[PDB]
Amino acid sequence: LDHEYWMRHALTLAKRAWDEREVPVGAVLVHNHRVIGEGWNRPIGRHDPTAHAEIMALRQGGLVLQNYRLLDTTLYVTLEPCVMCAGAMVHSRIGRVVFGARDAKTGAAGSLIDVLHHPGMNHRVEIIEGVLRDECATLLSDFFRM
Amino acid sequence: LDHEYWMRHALTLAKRAWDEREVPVGAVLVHNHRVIGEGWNRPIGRHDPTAHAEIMALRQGGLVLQNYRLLDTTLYVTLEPCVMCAGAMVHSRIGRVVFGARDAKTGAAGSLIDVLHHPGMNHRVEIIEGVLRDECATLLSDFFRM
Ligand SMILES: [Zn+2]
Ligand SMILES: [Zn+2]
């Protein structure tokens, strides 16, 4: 579905997070080839431990759809989702998550844990990884070097 | 620390959720024996898949402390936290979670999965279960009967 076109927008949002001095992750939630939520990482600034990119984008999606269930959506994100965000995607009943770089240490879509296909969740999210992978990694690498 | 006194307040918040026709879960975040966040379940009403009791209470706590890290806090909740909320508690670096009833099917503190002591998280949350257990269960049972 030209996943790079949507990931590019996510990288755009990640660079907002970068300008805010937050770990640079961006996310966009797409429904019928239209954006219905955007998010970027801002826990430090918002004083909000839950203010990850995915959480912000899933919340917008709910407002836009007037529904807490976000059926058949695709969530794009520049980094593999953490446990908190992976659980949110499961509650949201999204169709699919597409991510850029793996989070080898604490990623929760097959890196540390695979919450999205854990055998007791009432909903399965499909996974596609590595979209604009090197672009997503370099943002995060330059961040940590900084 | 008279955990029933704080759980009673959580049950108070859970009954707000009940009056809103939402699964009746309440939560309170306590720091130095003072409440610094309250929460109750309202996904349906807020059109927000992330709007669980714990998420709302952890968010308030961050505002009150002007910090996304909520060190040495105790989060009380009427039901075992789900994967999404268990991950949030880990990111928040809370000291302890105290819960009422187990969620046998999808609870993420030793029921379905134990996210809070999973061997790769950078932070361990202590767990105490069963506080006002029967009170918490009956609320949820009456809800599902309804
Ligand atoms: Zn996350
Ligand atoms: Zn939850």
TrEMBL record, chains A, B:
Q: Provide the GO biological process annotations.
A: tRNA wobble adenosine to inosine editing
> CMP/dCMP-type deaminase domain spans which residues?
1-112
Can you tell me which residues form the catalytic site?
54 (proton donor)
Give the enzyme's EC designation: 3.5.4.33
Catalyzed reaction equations: adenosine(34) in tRNA + H2O + H(+) = inosine(34) in tRNA + NH4(+)
**Bound cofactor: record note:** Binds 1 zinc ion per subunit.
Instruction: Name its co-factor(s).
Output: Zn(2+)
Q: Name one GO molecular function term.
A: tRNA-specific adenosine-34 deaminase activity
Keywords annotated in UniProt: Hydrolase, Metal-binding, tRNA processing, Zinc
Hydrolase recorded as keyword: yes
Residue numbers binding Zn(2+) = 52, 54, 82, 85
Primary enzyme class: hydrolase
Q: What does the subunit section of this Swiss-Prot or TrEMBL entry state?
A: Homodimer.
Q: Which family does it belong to?
A: Belongs to the cytidine and deoxycytidylate deaminase family. ADAT2 subfamily.
Relate the protein's function as given in its record: Catalyzes the deamination of adenosine to inosine at the wobble position 34 of tRNA(Arg2).
Q: What is this protein called?
A: tRNA-specific adenosine deaminase
User: From which source organism is this entry?
Assistant: Salmonella choleraesuis (strain SC-B67)
